[PDB]
């Protein structure tokens, strides 16, 4: 909690890919660190620190500099399926097919050449 | 002057004390009373100038609103060096079909 | 304005727990009062001003001082049963305007034992399709069963934003054992939606139940987890469930994207073949 | 009325208030003096035009009024309500935008196929 | 000295113009507050009534004192179902005394909105995950129509409660009854409460239209960035698919 | 409803290209 | 300094606890107890990895920590959040992953096309 | 929508190749 420090809280569903963190520092100086390094400074009209989109899949260490001695870093970690692919019949089957005419096209192909 | 304006459920609607004067823009529908105007879906980009009249301090007072939404349903991400990669990909293709055509001919 | 903490409180039989209320438009009459279901609004010792006290209507149990005309503080020395109610904070300027400005209140609960309280459980439901096909409206019901006391709040939330538009929750829990007490509360909430905005699978749904319950630094010696004041909550997202959605227009653009690399891989390699042939010939 | 002319550049955004002649203006942004200052090099001001660096979404959409300097804010009768999203090098193309390279990506393909089969 | 107000209870259709009386026993009195509670909350008070004024208005409100008849009034015009709450009446003291209002027993409002289109339907909504109850929905039923509790203990049905959906301006009545044990098939759930014949029972059997979901369909700048992806590698392939096909024509010549 | 460019007038839009060249061709043989 | 070791595999989610070695490690997640015992079939604790087996997103996207026996999991040095919606056998298409399915398709092919060739 | 447009690329795509291997084979 707050009196373990781990000041970095997450924003994060928002009807766009945007993740949100939250710092709860005071508002005279805000820094961000990822993985330790300087990465970003944040003036005190913003709150909010942004990654990008969720499919990007945003796994890091985070942690803002605040008036004392920095922050609890937060090991935040995304595995979206951008990229998963639903092993259904209907999918096996479809590249099986287009693949299998494919190959058909390659040996009409090289017969016709060779 | 404020004229208030929220965005229940996808949908943008345009709320004042009295009825809506339309000037050049979306027209949207009117909902079962006059003084609330709606907009239509929200990313399909609502644009335009309405007017109306407050009540009781402000009356009479003229009041213009001009409402503009640019929502990137119609955007795409592509940095400098991805462009310049695909004019490259697609000029060697190109320069590939015209070698292609000089065998041929 | 008025300011009274803390929204909620449970006790145990034998406590002490200090109520704060604030001002700050020098308001130099403060008052509480206790408001018991059903037969009438009652009166708690008041103050004019700094320094002095005259005492309410129901005095016996309750306890202020006034040493600052900002802050007025009522203190339960002992906690009795008896002394479950709801309590209110009121202030008020002297002969200008008479007009009062009362806060936004206080639930207090005194129990024999800790170890009757319960923490809620959320359950989210998902609107029948014979609605939608109907009246082309979606409703979703939440429902907070079994918790005791009833220091219970209820919310929803839509991609991460509070709704405060189609939303009904039942003004009274419902006890699910009503011939005895004590009983565990049941609670329900209403939220109704077009059928196109709840057909969306990118819109999620969220009904939130926070519940107001013992302190860390209660002693808790129960064989259960100490139901410490958290919060519960229960997600939902939108479907459809007989139509194509974006969920297949994303799986089965990617699965396309995917193939034309086979393709253009298998495409590449032949051009290779070919044009490796037709150079070497060139050459020799 | 003159409308405002916004104009977007990925992230870069540029308001114009061509309303008054100019020769003194100041900006508000949900009843904030936003623009007055050089103590930030996010923003800026021009003789006509207001510039905004990392526009962000979230927190930096609202109501947007000229002054012009000397002016109150309420006398003010003539708002801009705006709320847009933006990415870094994000820019606008129309369905029949998008569609045009295409035909010519084929037209100018046709200009090669004619010549070299020639030689 | 004491406060007494006339009815204590009240229910009315929407649109309806409504007259409340506040009593009090000592005209001796400078204040007079009206307040609102719903059904708790705080107290929200719009309204001001002084010794010196007669009559005082505010928004939609009417308000009159008679000191000489010791009566206070309050008028609603055109009612509106936001007005359903519990209404309060205040008054202090006029001497320089302790300043203690005096409330009285205070006095509840309901609004009954006025449904155009009544369409009575039961919905069975389907049980979730990590729960062994089944929920049942009744809703769209006339004003005239209200139901009352279960005739077992292991059935819970709640009060009819009104809904306000902005973005259609639409109000609607509804009522959720659930059961853990047996049995629960809503068709017999609603029975201690008599309703209109007309309601609507849908089958089990469940159908939809693909048109009605097309409606909700949206876009995201990822999946244009992948459709464009699709389209160049499309132009891709045409290119090496014909200069492929020349190739197998100028080896085969 | 909104597409965006993900209109599926795009996703018949290059099939055309060998749409309307296919109906040309066929010309040879008759 | 060490981070959070996480393992995937189909519907089966297992996480592991590098630090504080040698100490009895317990679990919380969204700040309730978590762990082995026979309370439920579907979770399941190590020495120093926890387990999950049929994985939903819906309730078990969350914050989680390790934290030694007797030390106050709030006192523990680190936090971590964590989303994923599981499939059941759905591999996935990272970047360098799907380079590979292509090389190995020039693999198979390359082989069946001299056959023909030599044919 | 997409897979019913790959169907037809597909239809075109195998009379195409039918046709191109009918005046291949007619001319020389
Ligand atoms: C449309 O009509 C509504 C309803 O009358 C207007 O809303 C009202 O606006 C006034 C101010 O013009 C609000 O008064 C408020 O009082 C206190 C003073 O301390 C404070 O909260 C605010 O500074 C404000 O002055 C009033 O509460 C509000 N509502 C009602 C029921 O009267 C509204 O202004 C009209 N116009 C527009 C453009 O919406
Ligand atoms: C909303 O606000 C306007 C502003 O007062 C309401 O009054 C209308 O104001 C316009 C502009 O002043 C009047 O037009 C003028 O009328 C006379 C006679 O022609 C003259 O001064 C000008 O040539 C000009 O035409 C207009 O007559 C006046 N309308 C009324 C009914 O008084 C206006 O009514 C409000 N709109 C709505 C839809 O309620
Ligand atoms: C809180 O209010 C309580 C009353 O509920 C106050 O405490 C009680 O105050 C009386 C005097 O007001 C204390 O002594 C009394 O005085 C004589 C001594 O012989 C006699 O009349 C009574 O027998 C009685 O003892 C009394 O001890 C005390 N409480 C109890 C439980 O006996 C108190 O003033 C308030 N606390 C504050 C203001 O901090
Ligand atoms: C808040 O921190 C920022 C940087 O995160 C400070 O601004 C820069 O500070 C560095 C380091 O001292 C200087 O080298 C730069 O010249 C500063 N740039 C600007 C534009 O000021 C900033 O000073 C801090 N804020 C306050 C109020 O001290
Ligand atoms: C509330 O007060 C009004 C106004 O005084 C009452 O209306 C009067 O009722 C009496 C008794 O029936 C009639 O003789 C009067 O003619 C009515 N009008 C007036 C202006 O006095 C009304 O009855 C009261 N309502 C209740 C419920 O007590
Ligand atoms: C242009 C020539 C090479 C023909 C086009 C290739 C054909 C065989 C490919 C191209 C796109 C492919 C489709 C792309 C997406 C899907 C959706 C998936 O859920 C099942 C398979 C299915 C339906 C694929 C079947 C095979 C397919 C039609
Ligand atoms: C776009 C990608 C996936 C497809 C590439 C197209 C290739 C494989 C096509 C284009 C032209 C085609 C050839 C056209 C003509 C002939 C002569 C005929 O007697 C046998 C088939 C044969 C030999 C075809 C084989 C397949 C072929 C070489
Ligand atoms: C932060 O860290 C040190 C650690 O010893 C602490 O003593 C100090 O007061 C803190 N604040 C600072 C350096 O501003
Ligand atoms: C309401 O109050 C107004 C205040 O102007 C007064 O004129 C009117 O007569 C009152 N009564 C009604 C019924 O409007
Ligand atoms: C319900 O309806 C009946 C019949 O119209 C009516 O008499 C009764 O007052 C209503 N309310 C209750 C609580 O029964
Ligand atoms: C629900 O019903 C089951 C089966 O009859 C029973 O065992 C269980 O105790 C019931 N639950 C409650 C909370 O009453
Ligand atoms: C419901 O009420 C009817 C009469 O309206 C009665 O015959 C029946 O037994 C009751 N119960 C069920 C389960 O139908």
């Known amino acids: 909690s707050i009196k373990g420090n781990h000041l970095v809280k997450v924003y994060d569903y928002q009807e766009d890919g945007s993740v949100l963190l939250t710092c709860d520092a005071e508002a005279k100086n805000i820094t961000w660190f990822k993985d330790g390094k300087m990465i970003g400074f944040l003036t005190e009209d913003k709150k909010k620190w942004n990654l990008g989109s969720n499919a990007k899949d945003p796994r890091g260490m985070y942690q803002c500099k605040g008036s004392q001695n920095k922050s609890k870093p937060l090991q935040v970690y995304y595995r979206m399926c951008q990229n998963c692919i639903e092993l259904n019949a209907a999918t096996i089957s479809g590249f099986l097919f287009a693949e299998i005419v494919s190959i058909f096209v390659l040996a009409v192909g090289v017969y016709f050449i060779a | 002057f404020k004229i208030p304006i929220e965005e229940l459920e996808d949908r943008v609607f345009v709320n004042c004390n009295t009825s809506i004067t339309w000037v050049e823009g979306t027209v949207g529908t009117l909902l079962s009373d006059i003084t609330r105007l709606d907009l239509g879906k929200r990313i399909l980009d609502p644009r335009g100038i309405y007017r109306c009249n407050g009540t009781d301090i402000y009356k009479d007072k003229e009041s213009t609103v001009q409402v503009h939404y640019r929502m990137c349903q119609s955007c795409v991400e592509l940095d400098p060096a991805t462009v310049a990669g695909i004019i490259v990909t697609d000029v060697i293709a190109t320069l590939l079909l015209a070698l292609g055509v000089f065998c041929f001919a | 304005g008025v300011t009274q903490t803390p929204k909620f409180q449970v006790l145990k039989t034998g406590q002490s727990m200090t109520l704060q209320c604030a001002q700050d438009?020098?308001?130099?009459?403060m008052s509480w009062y206790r408001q018991d279901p059903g037969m009438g609004l009652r009166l708690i010792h008041y103050?004019?001003?700094?320094?002095?006290?005259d005492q309410g209507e129901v005095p016996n149990g309750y306890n202020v001082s006034r040493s600052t005309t900002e802050d007025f503080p009522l203190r339960l020395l002992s906690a009795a049963p008896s002394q479950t109610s709801v309590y209110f904070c009121?202030?008020?300027?002297?002969?200008?305007?008479?007009?009062?400005?009362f806060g936004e209140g206080s639930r207090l609960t005194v129990l024999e034992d800790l170890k009757n309280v319960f923490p809620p459980e959320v359950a989210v439901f998902e609107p029948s399709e014979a609605e939608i096909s109907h009246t082309q409206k979606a409703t979703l019901v939440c429902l907070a069963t079994g918790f005791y006391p009833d220091h219970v709040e209820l919310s929803w939330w839509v991609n991460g934003k509070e709704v405060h538009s189609g939303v009904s929750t039942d003004p009274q829990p419902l006890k699910e054992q009503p011939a005895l007490n004590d009983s565990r509360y049941c609670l329900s909430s209403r939220l109704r939606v077009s059928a196109t905005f709840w057909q969306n699978p990118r819109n999620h749904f969220r009904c939130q139940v926070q519940f107001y319950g013992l302190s860390e630094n209660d002693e808790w010696t129960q064989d259960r987890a100490k139901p410490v004041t958290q919060i519960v909550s229960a997600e939902a997202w939108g479907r459809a469930d007989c139509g194509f959605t974006s969920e297949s227009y994303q799986q089965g653009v990617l699965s396309a994207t995917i193939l034309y690399e086979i393709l253009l891989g298998k495409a590449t390699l032949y051009a290779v073949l070919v044009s490796a042939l037709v150079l070497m010939a060139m050459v020799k | 009325q003159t409308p405002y002319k916004v104009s977007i550049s990925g992230t870069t955004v540029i308001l114009t208030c061509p309303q008054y002649p100019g020769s003194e203006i100041l900006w508000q942004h949900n009843d904030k003096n936003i623009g007055g200052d050089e103590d930030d090099k996010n923003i800026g001001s021009d003789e006509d035009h207001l510039s905004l660096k990392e526009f962000s979404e979230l927190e930096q959409s609202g109501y947007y009024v000229c002054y012009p300097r000397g002016s109150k804010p309420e006398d003010a009768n003539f708002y801009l309500y705006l709320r847009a999203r933006v990415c870094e090098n994000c820019m606008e193309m129309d369905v029949m935008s998008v569609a045009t390279i295409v035909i010519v990506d084929i037209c100018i393909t046709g200009g090669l196929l004619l010549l070299v089969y020639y030689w | 000295q004491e406060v007494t107000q006339i009815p204590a209870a009240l229910s009315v259709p929407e649109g309806e113009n409504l007259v409340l009386n506040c009593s009090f026993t000592?005209?001796?009195?400078?204040?007079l507050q009206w307040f609102r509670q719903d059904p708790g909350k705080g107290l929200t008070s719009l309204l001001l009534?002084?010794?010196?004024?007669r009559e005082q208005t505010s928004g939609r409100l009417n308000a009159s004192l008679d000191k000489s008849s010791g009566r206070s009034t309050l008028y609603i015009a055109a009612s509106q179902p936001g007005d359903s709450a519990t209404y309060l009446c205040?008054?202090?003291?006029?001497?320089?005394?302790?300043?203690?209002?005096?409330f009285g027993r205070g006095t509840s409002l309901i609004v009954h909105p006025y449904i155009q289109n009544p369409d009575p339907a039961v919905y069975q909504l389907r049980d979730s995950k990590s729960s062994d109850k089944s929920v049942c929905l009744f809703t769209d039923f006339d004003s005239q129509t209200n139901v009352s509790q279960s005739k077992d203990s292991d059935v819970y049905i709640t009060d009819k409660t009104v809904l306000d959906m902005r973005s259609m301006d639409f109000k609607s009545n509804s009522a959720v009854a659930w059961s853990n044990k047996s049995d629960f098939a809503c068709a017999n759930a609603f029975n201690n409460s008599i309703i209109p014949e007309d309601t609507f029972f849908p089958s089990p059997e469940s159908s939809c239209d693909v048109k009605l979901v097309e409606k909700s369909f949206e876009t995201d700048t990822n999946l244009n960035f992948q459709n464009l992806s699709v389209i160049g590698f499309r132009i891709l392939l045409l290119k090496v698919a014909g200069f492929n096909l020349l190739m197998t024509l100028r080896l085969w010549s | 409803q909104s597409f965006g460019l993900l209109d599926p007038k795009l996703c018949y839009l290059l099939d055309g290209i060998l749409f309307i060249y296919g109906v040309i061709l066929t010309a040879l043989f008759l | 300094q060490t981070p959070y070791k996480v393992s995937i595999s189909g519907t089966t989610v297992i996480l592991t606890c590098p630090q504080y070695p040698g100490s009895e490690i317990l679990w919380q997640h969204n700040d309730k107890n978590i762990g082995g015992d026979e309370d439920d079939k579907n979770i399941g604790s190590d020495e120093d990895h926890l387990s999950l087996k049929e994985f939903s997103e819906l309730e078990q996207s969350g914050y989680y920590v390790c934290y030694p026996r007797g030390s106050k999991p709030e006192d523990a040095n680190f936090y971590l959040y964590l989303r994923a919606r599981v499939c059941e056998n759905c591999m996935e298409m990272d970047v360098m992953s799907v380079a590979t399915i292509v090389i190995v398709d020039i693999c198979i092919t390359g082989g069946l096309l001299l056959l023909v060739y030599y044919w | 929508d997409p897979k019913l447009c790959y169907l037809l690329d597909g239809i075109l795509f195998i009379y195409g190749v039918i046709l191109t291997a009918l005046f291949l084979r007619v001319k020389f």
């Open positions: 009121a202030s008020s300027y002297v002969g200008n305007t008479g007009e009062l400005f």
């Open positions: 438009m020098n308001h130099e009459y």
């Open positions: 103050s004019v001003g700094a320094g002095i006290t």
């Open positions: 000592d005209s001796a009195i400078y204040n």
């Open positions: 009534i002084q010794s010196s004024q």
């Open positions: 205040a008054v202090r003291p006029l001497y320089g005394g302790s300043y203690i209002p005096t």
